Amino acid sequence: AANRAPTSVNAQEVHRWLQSFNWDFKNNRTKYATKYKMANETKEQFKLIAKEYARMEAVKDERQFGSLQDALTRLNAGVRVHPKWNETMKVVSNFLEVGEYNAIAATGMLWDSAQAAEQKNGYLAQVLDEIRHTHQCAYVNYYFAKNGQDPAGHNDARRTRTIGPLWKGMKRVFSDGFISGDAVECSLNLQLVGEACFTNPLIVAVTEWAAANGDEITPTVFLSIETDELRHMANGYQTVVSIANDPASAKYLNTDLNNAFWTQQKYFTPVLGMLFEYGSKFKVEPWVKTWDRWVYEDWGGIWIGRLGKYGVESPRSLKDAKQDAYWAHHDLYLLAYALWPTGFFRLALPDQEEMEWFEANYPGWYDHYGKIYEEWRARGCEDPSSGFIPLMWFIENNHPIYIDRVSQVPFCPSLAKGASTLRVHEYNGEMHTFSDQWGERMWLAEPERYECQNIFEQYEGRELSEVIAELHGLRSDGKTLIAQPHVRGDKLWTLDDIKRLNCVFKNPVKAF
Amino acid sequence: AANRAPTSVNAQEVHRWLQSFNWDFKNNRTKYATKYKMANETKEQFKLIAKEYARMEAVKDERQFGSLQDALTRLNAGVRVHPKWNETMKVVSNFLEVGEYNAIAATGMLWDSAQAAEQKNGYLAQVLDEIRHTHQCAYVNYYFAKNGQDPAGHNDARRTRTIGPLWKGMKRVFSDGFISGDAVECSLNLQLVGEACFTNPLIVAVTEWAAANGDEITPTVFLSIETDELRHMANGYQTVVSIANDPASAKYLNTDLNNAFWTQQKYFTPVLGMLFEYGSKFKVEPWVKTWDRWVYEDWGGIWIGRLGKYGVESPRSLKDAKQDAYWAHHDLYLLAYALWPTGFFRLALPDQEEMEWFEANYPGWYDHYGKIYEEWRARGCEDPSSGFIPLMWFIENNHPIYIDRVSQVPFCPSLAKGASTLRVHEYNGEMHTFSDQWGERMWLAEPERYECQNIFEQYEGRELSEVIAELHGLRSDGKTLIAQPHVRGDKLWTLDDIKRLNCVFKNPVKAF
Amino acid sequence: LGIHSNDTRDAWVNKIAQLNTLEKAAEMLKQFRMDHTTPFRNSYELDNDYLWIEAKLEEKVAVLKARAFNEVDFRHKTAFGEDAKSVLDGTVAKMNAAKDKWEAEKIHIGFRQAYKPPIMPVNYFLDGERQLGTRLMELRNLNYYDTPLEELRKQRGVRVVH
Amino acid sequence: ERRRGLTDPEMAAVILKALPEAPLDGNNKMGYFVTPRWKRLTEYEALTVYAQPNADWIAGGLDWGDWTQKFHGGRPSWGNETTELRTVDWFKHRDPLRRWHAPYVKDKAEEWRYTDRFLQGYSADGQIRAMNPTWRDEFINRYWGAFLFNEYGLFNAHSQGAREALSDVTRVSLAFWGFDKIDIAQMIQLERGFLAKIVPGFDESTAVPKAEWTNGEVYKSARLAVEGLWQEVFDWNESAFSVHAVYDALFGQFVRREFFQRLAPRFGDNLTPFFINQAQTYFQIAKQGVQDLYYNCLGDDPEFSDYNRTVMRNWTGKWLEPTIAALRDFMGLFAKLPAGTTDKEEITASLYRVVDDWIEDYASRIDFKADRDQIVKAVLAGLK
Amino acid sequence: ERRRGLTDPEMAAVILKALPEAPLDGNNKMGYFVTPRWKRLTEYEALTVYAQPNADWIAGGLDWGDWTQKFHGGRPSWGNETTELRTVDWFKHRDPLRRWHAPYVKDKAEEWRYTDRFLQGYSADGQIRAMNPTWRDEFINRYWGAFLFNEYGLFNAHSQGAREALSDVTRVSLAFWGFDKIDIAQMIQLERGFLAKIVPGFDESTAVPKAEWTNGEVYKSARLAVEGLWQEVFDWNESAFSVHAVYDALFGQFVRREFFQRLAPRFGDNLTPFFINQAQTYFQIAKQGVQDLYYNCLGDDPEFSDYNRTVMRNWTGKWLEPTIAALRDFMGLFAKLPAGTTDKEEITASLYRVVDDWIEDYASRIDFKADRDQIVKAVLAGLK
């Protein structure tokens, strides 16, 4: 029996008093350098408490792991995916994994920066979400390694990623850019630009291409990840709202935003276009179309437009970004393929249908890239017995490949249908190579922030097979390379095939 | 902080003392009539407590519901199934549902019978498991109704099943056979025979046929149900062990076992093979082989053999069951199809490939059933404007269809390739029709246990469409019948189409 | 030789193994930082190995410092015996007196080369990062794009090779 | 190997080709014909209502005809003859908490796993240290331990109802009411098992508490009432009603809430309350279903309200006497407590809480005239 | 409509045709190169170890080279310079409970839903009726409520650590240690919000307990210690070690276990202990991880054991004084209790339990010579 209606208390009823949890003391201030003042009293959109946060995420996990462990496994979904996509997912899942990971630290920094309890609380949920995302991306690679057609790379990307050049650029946008700098600049890189402009649309697009390529594992996980992203957008919006009524905002916000925007697009523009168009059999949409909608229209227009009332304006480098875009991903794949022995994934030359698709969507593609790929195939780039690596063609044709000192994006000025700009400076006994006016200014103004050693500096004078060997770029048989210049089941290249080529790295800037 | 290692207590540590929970008092005895005595020191195989039981099943549920709600729905798995199989599952899931349901009450009766706390506990786990299974079978119909190609029937089988004759037999083996009689006879019908001989192997077989026919929903659910079955077979085995050391066992056990075996096989032998072979497009295995392996080998041989030490012998009616088995399913489908307007599902005539498959696996199939199906098709049985229902062919060719008073299984002795037995008796003003020697003895010895009114008795003098209308056998438009003689999406039969035929039921026994 | 193990790294752990006093270890670490770290380093000869070598030198200084200093000094004195709080405050004061971004970067960068843990206690050092970085950025980020690149190249002092 | 129709190109092509243009019926709602209790049909209702194959001759059944096989003698599989209560429709009941199997086991599993963590934390935290040894060794071990038999008996009282329930909705509630009872009995043993692990010399054997239940004075009338409710009642409704709306509502609530939950804290015992919290949560969950079935559906039946109330009042009187005797004997436990533990004023107040709660939640719903003072005085006669 | 490659006959056939005959590598175990802590690699480890992209120059890192973008001034994204502690490998740590995101939110969610059912049960059961009003109104509302700010401060102390942790395993453990603290602060408010619902006139506003925390005497040194640990410490390890292995292990444990958990029961309060059960469960869970990181990995490091123990003993001494000061001011609360609630003998034994537990679990692990009597006597000095 008894008397009194069953009653309880929910998240909102507790959250109502959360702003009051913080109290005043002289040293109650952020531990991180910043030009800005995050207003105390700043509120958050989602009225969450730790327990309700856990419950909402647990239900999602239930669904996700249920699908993965039961039906998808029974359907052998880890196997029935196009070979090319199995390879792309090694990079997509592990590279995204590092962004999820660094985003945990970034939001810890933002939690520290915020003075209002609600704002700290908003960043806190994202701290927990990014841990969730780290483990989810890790799980995608775990699953493909456990149940797929080629586990190598999926099973050790955390260490095999270190052999190649594309990884350095990923660390710039999704690791260091997220945590090294004024907390606000990091927030712009992470939330306002990174998540709002690239990650949010990318995650869903990835599920589209995955599905097209027979992969139902990625949609299961990535669609679950995307359900948390709304709260992260709010955190980014709140960052701007929190600092907008301070004099520093008028002086600094737009340049931090412009620098963050350039930073993010510099890598994603060529890389994501490359992963989509060249890492798939079935295509969903040409990247030129996608990029314009995502960056120029959706983000550059609408999203940013909602921040105009806080003094935010369109990045001054947006025009430059659009101009450099068109051929960016095509230019990059040439280098990624030429440097295939340095990866932790297998790559393929575009087949006849793809070349036709490329030309139809990018007039002039065949005359430049198409002919080159055909020449490389004739030289025997797919065959272990050829003794040919495309990098050899770059040397024979006087086409040096440089690494941008700031973004880490590889570029070949003399070949590129895109940018073709190159700036080389010598300073205090060291030379630096830049690919654009924005990154050049970043280094000139902040040289001590950009001292990253490039692949050619570290591997200088080293023979390729010894680098691959020391960095564990081999499959379990201890001889066959993880990376390959084709996605077929045989004629796989071995360490000895690489050793016989006797490719010894040289630092290209030494030509100057 | 601490002082002492973290400690807890598990199910088994609590279970160690469960047998002692029951205590002695004069009226501590079963409330149900029984010839047997379940030993009060009987132990159970699974050392479970309520909490651990719940956790075990909760883990299974999250996996299952995760698959259904996430991946399978994203895959449109509710739709991409062969039309014939969509229909078969209306029957398979709802009919099995009543079995799970009555099994709850059966195990309640058994829990009341058991005097040992442990034995009661085992039966109790099953009570809860069968509740789980009821909601699971219900969910399969619910899922196909919500997301499938034809919701009618899946959406209301609990009331539309009452229109047809196949449902009557289902209630005998899986409803009344489980709960009406000596608790031990009920246990033999449920556990020793029903689950051990039919359900356990059937559930798995269903997932294979479902998978072949594009159905991934049923495997996800039925594979989950299967994980609980071993506990139930342990219950059946324990029932025998608990009563074996008492004088009553030698006098009565093999008789109750024989009666239970015949009861279950009488319905399942023709029905299962019919649902599999005629309810599918793609075939997994011919029923003749399956039946022989399940019933003769696995069960009658191995499974039963394990109970020999308790005085259990292979049922005396086994050879008779094998004799009548061969053509049983084929003979019955003719009847189910002839009476198609009384169902809650759509039936199809075998296509040309199936006809070849049937003749290949059942020589003589074509000149008997093949000819009949071809004649029916020629008469326009699939066409609503034909004015023909196969029931009419039976009437024209003098082949009365009877309903066994005991098993409720419909039989046509004059046309059957299998058994032709027909025994008709008049007793105290009423006639009774039997199809076999075993059921005849059951009625003669226990007439008051078998008074079930048959469809011809209930529907006597009624025009077909009036029966279908009253019992809600229509689709949502209130015109089209749920049941159909074809599985195509066009030219569906209407209530008026049936009314125009002016088919009025006659009690076949009035001809004597 | 390799990326993670090579002759130069080997040569350095041998030299580090010979340090036997906090003062010589701290001096070698400080000299190492002036010689091999930041864009202002005296030489780029150790570009591929200095980061790791520095860490090994830091370990030696740390271990010797914990043995040498009493508890209060371990918390409040630099490896060279200076009062950390006094150095922190004076350095921040110089930074706040900086008249432009050029003077400012020299103060911050130099502070790092000289006091990075285990020289100055971490609590004081990161409090310095908090204060110094703020002023450096306020100065650098003001009118960030006003100076044309041709002039910014000259301000920085690069030799344009192009 | 195994080719699946959903993924196999050739097989899927065949399936896809046979598929209709759109679904053959737009009514994609399973259970659409069930009358919703609430605004819209719930999953609980859809998956449960009409699963029981009753014919129209058992109030509310949708089927027709006799059962196919009955008991020797002719007793029906299910029938009106198994209970005195009558109704317009046995399918009206709805568990207000809407629990079908999935949510029921989900919640219990959470409780099991959190219980495990709590115990790991309690043992690691050394919380037993401040627990009074006498309360621990005498009261928890023997007296609370003995109560496990009461809950076990109550669980067993449900066996016949699991077999005789006349609808799916009542059967599911009934099973869950019984399953919670056995869970509580096991939680009492679990505590004794935990104590045996963290307290040197503590014996988890049930011999002591069992002897207290089967031979002691304190629980004599309790055991007698339990034995009767379980084995002397053959009416499934009399059993569920008298167990939940009379005996356990008065005696059980007194022992769990007014004795142990109220007093254990005074002896530095937060361990027993951790489990009693589960018992009280379970009791309150069951109450809502018991109230819906016996009052909303049966006692307020548009045709049989007056009849059903007459029968339920008859059962209340029938079982109130042995329940009062149970409470009366239990009063003897107060004299065994250390001096100064509680007093007559607190005891009287606690009795009135139980009685008033019972009158409000159960007795008044059927117009049963309970005299709160008469009942409390009758119970207090076993105190002094 | 979209065509999926796994089910579309055309696309699947193209996919199937491209597949190799068997997997291109038999090693199907993701982090196979990770040194397992236990017999076989666990999921927790595979999904966590090496997620952090550290280069070899941060002990245990597998990458090479500098970070790509550093702070203005040159500070590294992560660097050895952020903590005094040194080690042969930052990836050595393992949470003994193996908590990655999934099991962590799973358990917390179970606790949340059970909390909801418990409150629904407690209110329906009328258990508030026998709770002492003075305890509820003064002690739970003001003093227990004030403690929310202590836990909140301890939560906030973790912010810098979330940013600076030098490995994935340490970052994950650290984040969970901090998230459990904010949860506890929120559970203290949740209880107050619950009382406001079931007790007329009870005000859930944090105004009163906040004023007690910011301006009262009992929590004066507590607040001073918290403000210090949070905002005056810039070393992520000093923060984590000092909070969990000094301050919270002594002050927090005393307040939660020896004051509120021990005394609330004497006032008919099983409500507060329900939430403290969670707090203590969380304390004991974090302890395992704190000990693994600071003792098993750092304090017992094969090359830096001596060094690390010197630093940790240093921090222990540094924070032991303000911790004692915190306990000392807290002794003032006993004088406010109703006469007869406790005595000096029980307070003294409770103090020894906390000190003795702290010495065995923490102090002794790094050879810190704590004098139990000396510590207890210093605290007792504040009784009134």
Ligand SMILES: [Fe+3]
């Ligand atoms: Fe994320």
Ligand SMILES: [Fe+3]
């Ligand atoms: Fe995010």
Ligand SMILES: [Fe+3]
């Ligand atoms: Fe079952």
Ligand SMILES: [Fe+3]
């Ligand atoms: Fe079963």
Ligand SMILES: [Xe]
């Ligand atoms: Xe990516």
Ligand SMILES: [Xe]
């Ligand atoms: Xe790619």
Ligand SMILES: [Xe]
């Ligand atoms: Xe290369």
Ligand SMILES: [Xe]
């Ligand atoms: Xe069936």
Ligand SMILES: [Xe]
């Ligand atoms: Xe079947």
Ligand SMILES: [Xe]
């Ligand atoms: Xe069928």
